[PDB]
Write a protein that binds this ligand. Structure first.
Ligand SMILES: [Zn+2]
Ligand SMILES: [Zn+2]
Ligand SMILES: [Zn+2]
Ligand SMILES: [Zn+2]
Lengths: 102, 102
Protein backbone atom coordinates (compact mmCIF):
# COMPACT_ATOMS: atom_id res chain seq x y z
CA UNK A 1 0.00 0.00 0.00
CA UNK A 2 1.04 3.64 -0.62
CA UNK A 3 -0.40 4.65 2.79
CA UNK A 4 0.20 1.78 5.28
CA UNK A 5 -0.75 3.89 8.32
CA UNK A 6 -4.15 4.66 6.75
CA UNK A 7 -4.63 0.98 5.84
CA UNK A 8 -3.64 -0.09 9.36
CA UNK A 9 -5.95 2.43 11.11
CA UNK A 10 -8.77 1.82 8.60
CA UNK A 11 -8.59 -1.95 8.89
CA UNK A 12 -9.11 -1.85 12.71
CA UNK A 13 -12.31 0.12 12.19
CA UNK A 14 -13.34 -2.06 9.26
CA UNK A 15 -12.92 -5.27 11.27
CA UNK A 16 -14.82 -3.86 14.24
CA UNK A 17 -17.67 -2.84 11.94
CA UNK A 18 -17.75 -6.25 10.18
CA UNK A 19 -17.86 -8.10 13.50
CA UNK A 20 -20.87 -6.07 14.60
CA UNK A 21 -22.61 -6.41 11.26
CA UNK A 22 -22.27 -10.18 11.17
CA UNK A 23 -23.22 -10.57 14.84
CA UNK A 24 -26.35 -8.46 14.32
CA UNK A 25 -27.61 -10.72 11.50
CA UNK A 26 -27.02 -13.97 13.42
CA UNK A 27 -24.93 -15.73 16.11
CA UNK A 28 -21.29 -16.36 15.17
CA UNK A 29 -18.34 -18.48 16.28
CA UNK A 30 -14.91 -16.87 16.34
CA UNK A 31 -13.50 -19.46 13.95
CA UNK A 32 -16.21 -18.66 11.39
CA UNK A 33 -15.60 -14.91 11.77
CA UNK A 34 -11.95 -15.48 10.81
CA UNK A 35 -13.05 -17.22 7.57
CA UNK A 36 -15.80 -14.66 6.89
CA UNK A 37 -13.49 -11.69 7.39
CA UNK A 38 -11.00 -13.34 5.06
CA UNK A 39 -13.77 -13.70 2.41
CA UNK A 40 -14.40 -9.93 2.75
CA UNK A 41 -10.67 -9.29 2.17
CA UNK A 42 -9.29 -8.69 5.68
CA UNK A 43 -6.15 -10.50 6.86
CA UNK A 44 -7.00 -11.49 10.42
CA UNK A 45 -5.49 -14.20 12.64
CA UNK A 46 -7.36 -15.77 15.63
CA UNK A 47 -4.50 -14.20 17.69
CA UNK A 48 -5.75 -10.74 16.67
CA UNK A 49 -9.49 -11.49 16.43
CA UNK A 50 -10.29 -13.03 19.83
CA UNK A 51 -8.96 -10.00 21.80
CA UNK A 52 -11.18 -7.79 19.58
CA UNK A 53 -14.14 -10.07 20.37
CA UNK A 54 -13.50 -9.96 24.09
CA UNK A 55 -13.10 -6.15 23.95
CA UNK A 56 -16.43 -5.79 22.14
CA UNK A 57 -18.15 -7.77 24.88
CA UNK A 58 -16.38 -5.68 27.55
CA UNK A 59 -17.64 -2.61 25.66
CA UNK A 60 -21.16 -4.08 25.99
CA UNK A 61 -21.55 -4.27 22.18
CA UNK A 62 -21.43 -8.06 21.96
CA UNK A 63 -22.62 -10.76 24.34
CA UNK A 64 -21.24 -14.30 24.29
CA UNK A 65 -22.77 -17.53 25.50
CA UNK A 66 -21.14 -20.83 26.35
CA UNK A 67 -22.87 -23.67 24.53
CA UNK A 68 -22.31 -27.42 24.61
CA UNK A 69 -23.45 -28.64 21.22
CA UNK A 70 -22.78 -32.19 19.98
CA UNK A 71 -20.41 -33.05 22.90
CA UNK A 72 -18.38 -29.90 22.24
CA UNK A 73 -18.13 -26.65 24.21
CA UNK A 74 -18.35 -23.53 22.01
CA UNK A 75 -18.68 -19.81 22.51
CA UNK A 76 -21.16 -17.87 20.35
CA UNK A 77 -21.28 -14.09 20.00
CA UNK A 78 -24.24 -11.85 19.18
CA UNK A 79 -24.92 -8.08 19.09
CA UNK A 80 -26.54 -6.55 22.19
CA UNK A 81 -29.09 -3.73 21.81
CA UNK A 82 -26.10 -1.39 22.40
CA UNK A 83 -24.31 -3.21 19.56
CA UNK A 84 -27.18 -2.66 17.10
CA UNK A 85 -27.22 1.04 18.03
CA UNK A 86 -23.39 1.21 17.66
CA UNK A 87 -23.72 -0.45 14.26
CA UNK A 88 -26.25 2.20 13.16
CA UNK A 89 -23.97 5.02 14.36
CA UNK A 90 -20.81 3.53 12.87
CA UNK A 91 -22.54 2.84 9.53
CA UNK A 92 -23.81 6.43 9.56
CA UNK A 93 -20.28 7.82 9.96
CA UNK A 94 -19.13 5.57 7.10
CA UNK A 95 -22.00 6.60 4.81
CA UNK A 96 -21.36 10.29 5.49
CA UNK A 97 -17.67 10.06 4.60
CA UNK A 98 -18.45 7.87 1.56
CA UNK A 99 -21.02 10.45 0.32
CA UNK A 100 -18.55 13.32 0.81
CA UNK A 101 -15.50 11.99 -1.11
CA UNK A 102 -17.05 9.69 -3.74
CA UNK B 1 -20.98 7.76 20.87
CA UNK B 2 -22.17 4.16 21.38
CA UNK B 3 -18.86 2.83 19.94
CA UNK B 4 -16.06 5.27 20.96
CA UNK B 5 -13.25 2.93 19.85
CA UNK B 6 -14.76 2.75 16.34
CA UNK B 7 -15.23 6.54 16.28
CA UNK B 8 -11.65 7.07 17.48
CA UNK B 9 -10.11 4.65 14.92
CA UNK B 10 -12.43 5.92 12.13
CA UNK B 11 -11.72 9.58 12.84
CA UNK B 12 -7.92 9.08 12.47
CA UNK B 13 -8.49 7.61 9.02
CA UNK B 14 -11.02 10.30 8.16
CA UNK B 15 -8.64 13.11 9.17
CA UNK B 16 -5.75 11.53 7.25
CA UNK B 17 -7.94 11.31 4.16
CA UNK B 18 -9.13 14.94 4.53
CA UNK B 19 -5.56 16.20 4.92
CA UNK B 20 -4.52 14.45 1.70
CA UNK B 21 -7.57 15.61 -0.17
CA UNK B 22 -7.10 19.26 0.81
CA UNK B 23 -3.34 19.13 0.11
CA UNK B 24 -3.97 17.64 -3.35
CA UNK B 25 -6.45 20.40 -4.32
CA UNK B 26 -4.19 23.26 -3.23
CA UNK B 27 -1.30 24.21 -0.91
CA UNK B 28 -2.22 24.52 2.79
CA UNK B 29 -0.96 26.14 5.97
CA UNK B 30 -1.25 24.01 9.12
CA UNK B 31 -3.27 26.72 10.89
CA UNK B 32 -5.80 26.72 8.04
CA UNK B 33 -6.03 22.91 8.08
CA UNK B 34 -7.04 23.12 11.76
CA UNK B 35 -9.93 25.50 10.83
CA UNK B 36 -10.88 23.45 7.78
CA UNK B 37 -10.94 20.17 9.66
CA UNK B 38 -13.08 21.85 12.33
CA UNK B 39 -15.55 22.97 9.62
CA UNK B 40 -15.77 19.34 8.45
CA UNK B 41 -16.60 18.28 12.04
CA UNK B 42 -13.29 16.94 13.39
CA UNK B 43 -11.88 17.99 16.76
CA UNK B 44 -8.22 18.60 16.02
CA UNK B 45 -5.62 20.43 18.10
CA UNK B 46 -2.29 21.67 16.63
CA UNK B 47 -0.73 19.20 19.13
CA UNK B 48 -2.38 16.33 17.23
CA UNK B 49 -2.24 17.78 13.68
CA UNK B 50 1.44 18.69 13.25
CA UNK B 51 2.73 15.17 14.13
CA UNK B 52 0.29 13.77 11.51
CA UNK B 53 1.65 16.31 8.99
CA UNK B 54 5.26 15.42 9.78
CA UNK B 55 4.44 11.67 9.52
CA UNK B 56 2.85 12.20 6.11
CA UNK B 57 5.99 13.99 4.91
CA UNK B 58 8.22 11.25 6.36
CA UNK B 59 6.03 8.77 4.46
CA UNK B 60 6.72 10.83 1.30
CA UNK B 61 2.98 11.59 0.90
CA UNK B 62 3.29 15.31 1.68
CA UNK B 63 6.07 17.82 1.09
CA UNK B 64 6.48 21.07 3.02
CA UNK B 65 8.42 24.18 2.13
CA UNK B 66 9.49 27.25 4.07
CA UNK B 67 8.22 30.22 2.08
CA UNK B 68 8.67 33.95 2.47
CA UNK B 69 5.62 35.73 1.12
CA UNK B 70 4.98 39.44 1.78
CA UNK B 71 8.02 39.68 4.16
CA UNK B 72 6.63 36.81 6.24
CA UNK B 73 8.00 33.29 6.62
CA UNK B 74 5.43 30.44 6.48
CA UNK B 75 5.44 26.65 6.03
CA UNK B 76 3.19 25.28 3.26
CA UNK B 77 2.23 21.65 2.68
CA UNK B 78 1.23 19.89 -0.57
CA UNK B 79 0.57 16.32 -1.78
CA UNK B 80 3.38 14.58 -3.66
CA UNK B 81 2.60 12.24 -6.58
CA UNK B 82 2.78 9.45 -3.94
CA UNK B 83 0.22 11.41 -1.90
CA UNK B 84 -2.24 11.57 -4.83
CA UNK B 85 -1.83 7.82 -5.34
CA UNK B 86 -2.27 7.21 -1.55
CA UNK B 87 -5.45 9.31 -1.68
CA UNK B 88 -6.78 7.13 -4.54
CA UNK B 89 -5.93 3.93 -2.61
CA UNK B 90 -7.40 5.21 0.66
CA UNK B 91 -10.60 6.37 -1.10
CA UNK B 92 -10.80 2.93 -2.73
CA UNK B 93 -10.60 1.17 0.66
CA UNK B 94 -13.41 3.45 1.89
CA UNK B 95 -15.60 2.68 -1.14
CA UNK B 96 -15.04 -1.06 -0.62
CA UNK B 97 -16.10 -0.95 3.05
CA UNK B 98 -19.10 1.27 2.15
CA UNK B 99 -20.18 -1.31 -0.50
CA UNK B 100 -19.80 -4.19 2.00
CA UNK B 101 -21.75 -2.98 5.07
CA UNK B 102 -24.37 -0.65 3.56
ZN1 LIG C 1 -20.01 -11.40 5.28
ZN1 LIG D 1 -12.21 15.37 0.59
ZN1 LIG E 1 -12.81 21.59 2.92
ZN1 LIG F 1 -15.83 16.24 5.73
Amino acid sequence: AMDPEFMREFQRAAVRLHILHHAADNEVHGAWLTQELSRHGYRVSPGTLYPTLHRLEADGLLVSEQRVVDGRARRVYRATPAGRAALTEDRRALEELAREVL
